[PDB]
């Protein structure tokens, strides 16, 4: 009855004085907007239907038109920013928040979904959803003794919507809204559904993507052990956000970085730094770089966990972007490490793969590598082993490459190049 209607027909039904006719047309609209090939969102908007759909959200007496309108508006709100704006401009936000209390679960869920699309547009709509008071009713839907009694699809939708309220920067979500949400997020991070876990980790990754104070809010809730556990999961959709969150945390203070180390994170990096997904390797190497930028005792834990050989590994062979992250990890290690730690790094074979990367067509990695050489030489100066290092560099083809670089466009390159040749060679 309600399949493949024209917009013209939907409009005629919706403008009828007949609630049942309006219901059939709203369902027809929903089915249009639910089609996979190019749903006519803009024709629906141009027909002036959004205000009608929004008014139908408020018809408590007619639950089916509430649902059909909810779903229609959800699909419009899933499109461009402009499409989402049209839904918001129609007054949908408060009307969807009212529907969170619906006795009908399918309607409540639709309202959750719609608010998730609205908040996911960006900071401004996210913050407007929050101002209209969405968070209390959302969290009330998860206030049960055991999350396992909720329907799977419902809990997944709620988690996804909450993650969108945690998302975006410039600005980041209000501190009080983050404090309000975090306890429910901690609970979802212990739920056993892979999709709930993935979206919970994504939420934590967003909340840790910022200054130390934002990181502290999360770290203080004691989630880092659970994040490290999830970092060891089989499901890539869990590992990806868990590793991003862990990586975000170690961009903070040395004491925040230590909580990740204390939680056992470094024991997973052998796998992460050899992971077949390029992105996991990249992000794991980035994470390592901000751990090697830490304290000497923190560098020592990297050493004890057997991870220097894995950094030599990624430097020797990886996607280029991973190799650049590894070069950073080495410069940081050499910058902050004791002489013994820097010696160990050479003993593990760092020199040849570093020198092979000086052939790269990237100015930044060259500068990074040259800084690392300088730091290593400085440790050799303190041991009076500058010559053995010079010979090592020379034997693997390094001296050739550094010489060339004395004649490179970038100034800091040729400078650092020249200094090395003239001081050690």
């Amino acid at each position: 009855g309600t399949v493949n209607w024209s917009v013209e027909d939907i409009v005629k039904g919706i403008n009828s004085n007949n609630l049942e006719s309006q219901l059939q047309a709203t369902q027809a609209a929903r089915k249009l907007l639910s089609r996979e090939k190019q749903p006519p969102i803009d024709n629906i908007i141009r027909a002036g239907l959004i205000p009608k759909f929004v008014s139908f959200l408020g018809k408590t007496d007619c639950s089916p038109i509430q649902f059909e309108s909810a779903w229609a508006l959800t699909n419009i709100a899933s499109g461009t920013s402009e499409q989402t704006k049209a839904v918001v401009d129609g007054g949908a936000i408060p009307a969807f928040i009212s529907l969170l209390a619906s006795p009908h679960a399918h309607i409540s869920e639709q309202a959750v979904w719609a608010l998730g699309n609205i908040a996911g547009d960006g900071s401004a709509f996210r913050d407007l959803v929050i101002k209209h008071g969405a968070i209390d009713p959302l969290l009330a839907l998860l206030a049960v003794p055991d999350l396992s009694t909720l329907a799977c699809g419902y809990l997944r939708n709620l988690t996804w919507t909450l993650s969108n309220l945690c998302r975006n920067k410039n600005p980041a979500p209000p501190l009080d809204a983050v404090e309000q949400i975090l306890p429910t997020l901690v609970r979802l991070l212990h739920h056993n559904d892979p999709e709930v876990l993935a979206d919970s980790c994504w939420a934590i990754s967003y909340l840790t993507d910022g200054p130390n104070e934002r990181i502290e809010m999360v770290v203080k809730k004691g989630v880092v052990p659970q994040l490290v556990k999830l970092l060891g999961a089989t499901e890539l959709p869990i590992v990806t956000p868990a590793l991003r969150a862990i990586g975000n945390i170690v961009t903070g203070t040395d004491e925040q970085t230590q909580k990740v180390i204390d939680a056992g994170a470094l024991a997973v990096f052998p796998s992460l730094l050899t992971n077949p997904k390029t992105n996991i390797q990249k992000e794991a190497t980035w994470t390592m770089s901000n751990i090697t930028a830490g304290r000497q005792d923190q560098i020592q834990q990297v050493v004890n966990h057997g991870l220097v050989p894995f950094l030599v590994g990624v430097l020797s062979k990886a996607d280029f972007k991973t190799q650049k992250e590894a070069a950073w990890a080495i410069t940081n290690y050499t910058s902050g490490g004791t002489v013994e730690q820097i010696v160990y790094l050479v003993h593990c074979g760092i020199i040849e793969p570093l020198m092979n990367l000086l052939s790269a067509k990237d100015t930044k990695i060259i500068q990074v590598i040259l800084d690392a050489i300088s730091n290593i030489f400085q440790a050799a100066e303190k041991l009076g082993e500058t010559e053995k290092l010079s010979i090592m560099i020379e034997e693997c083809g390094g001296l050739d490459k550094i010489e060339a670089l004395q004649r490179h466009e970038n100034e800091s390159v040729y400078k650092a190049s020249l200094n090395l040749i003239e001081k050690y060679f």
Partner: peptide, 6 residues
């Protein structure tokens, strides 16, 4: 030894 966010 400076942390670089991403």
């Amino acid at each position: 030894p400076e942390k670089k966010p991403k």
